[PDB]
Amino acid sequence: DKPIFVVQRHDARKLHYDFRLEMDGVLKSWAVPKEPPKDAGTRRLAIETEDHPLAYADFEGEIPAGEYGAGKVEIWDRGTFELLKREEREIVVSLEGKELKGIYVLIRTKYGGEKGWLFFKKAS
Numbered sequence: 001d002k003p004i005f006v007v008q009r010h011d012a013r014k015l016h017y018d019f020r021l022e023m024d025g026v027l028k029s030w031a032v033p034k035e036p037p038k039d040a041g042t043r044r045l046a047i048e049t050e051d052h053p054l055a056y057a058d059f060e061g062e063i064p065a066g067e068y069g070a071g072k073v074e075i076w077d078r079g080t081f082e083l084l085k086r087e088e089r090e091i092v093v094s095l096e097g098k099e100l101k102g103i104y105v106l107i108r109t110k111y112g113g114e115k116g117w118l119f120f121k122k123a124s
């Protein structure tokens, strides 16, 4: 399922992937510099970005220069998810997409400034 998740390939300064989870009516968002991992074993960096409105889960097209989020946007994956766990430094979700299926984990590093998240698919 009911809440949704979206992955948008964002062609901006660099090519990266925005990973978004519907929480509390908005899309909590992370920039991932590589494709979200389809299989366990691989860890990605995920950088928290600003919330996006829910309707953004449907957006595919180009954001004009000078805007936050400027660049080319394409839907890479889309689905629903079940939230298994959520705490200040940890999020565990079961994803139901076409590329991403199964349990995924976000853990906010305690190290360092604003702190990034370790992003991976559970070995399950």
Ligand SMILES: [Cl-]
Pocket: 032, 033, 034, 043, 044, 045, 046
């Ligand atoms: Cl990475």
Ligand SMILES: [Mn+2]
Pocket: 010, 012, 016, 017, 018, 031, 069
């Ligand atoms: Mn982005």
